[PDB]
Design a protein around this nucleic acid. Structure first.
Ligand SMILES: O=C(O)CCC(=O)C(=O)O
Ligand SMILES: [Mn+2]
Length: 203
DNA sequence: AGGTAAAACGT
DNA sequence: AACGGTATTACCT
């Protein structure tokens, strides 16, 4: 438990032991709602490929960003959140000082070499102020963690296989991002990084 | 009036 | 290549 910011911590290798089962369950989720690179409202295709599980999934569409109970590609609900995901999230949130966290949304991110996620905020969903639990699997990536304003100084932190990052409270709306993924090998993911992002998006 | 796109090129 | 412009507007509700 290292102190990243007010209300924020990195739990290094927290999910290392859980990783093989997490990846099996990523493959199961994606067999039903495949990874897809989403198109921004402005018309650009994201380099990260995404899917979701749980009741609500993050998605783009023409009018903005949305949490949706239906996968717009399959027109079916997102797959149920795997118990391995829910258990890991709960254990990490508790260790980070958020024992009451009840996620209903898990965004699954797949990074090929070169893929990035530019600095952004996970904005508040209506009447909600729950933390974010973020699990890294596979190849290492440089995570940017800033402040409430885009130009606030960035911390740059390598996130390796099994690292969990949790933010909330005062740091809930902090800008953050992932720098372009370096090519490499990992025994469990082969050639990519995955990330699991747990949120409470629904009342 | 308040929130949201940019979770996306130039120096 | 780290930093910051752009949304300094145009829409929605
Ligand atoms: O891949 C990561 O570590 C961060 C992902 C993220 O910020 C997101 O999906 O909102
Ligand atoms: Mn995010």
């Amino acid at each position: 438990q290292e102190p990243l910011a007010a209300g924020a911590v990195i739990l290094r290798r927290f999910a290392f032991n859980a990783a093989e089962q997490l990846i099996r369950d990523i493959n199961d989720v994606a067999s039903q709602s495949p990874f897809r690179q989403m198109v921004t409202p402005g018309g650009y295709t994201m380099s990260v490929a995404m899917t979701n599980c749980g009741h609500l999934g993050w998605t783009t569409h023409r009018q903005g960003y949305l949490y949706s109970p239906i996968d717009p590609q399959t027109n079916k609900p997102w797959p149920a959140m795997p118990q391995s995901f829910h258990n890991l999230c709960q254990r990490a949130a508790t260790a980070a000082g958020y024992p009451d966290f009840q996620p209903d949304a898990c965004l699954i991110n797949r990074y090929a070499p070169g893929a990035k996620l530019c600095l952004h905020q996970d904005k508040d969903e209506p009447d909600l102020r729950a933390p974010i639990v973020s699990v890294s699997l596979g190849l290492p990536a440089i995570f940017q963690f800033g402040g409430l304003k885009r130009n606030d100084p960035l911390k740059r932190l390598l996130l390796e296989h099994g690292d969990v990052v949790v933010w909330g409270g005062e740091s809930r709306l902090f800008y953050h991002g992932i720098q372009p993924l370096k090519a490499g090998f990992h025994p469990l993911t082969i050639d990519c990084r995955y990330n699991l992002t747990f949120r409470q998006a629904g009342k």
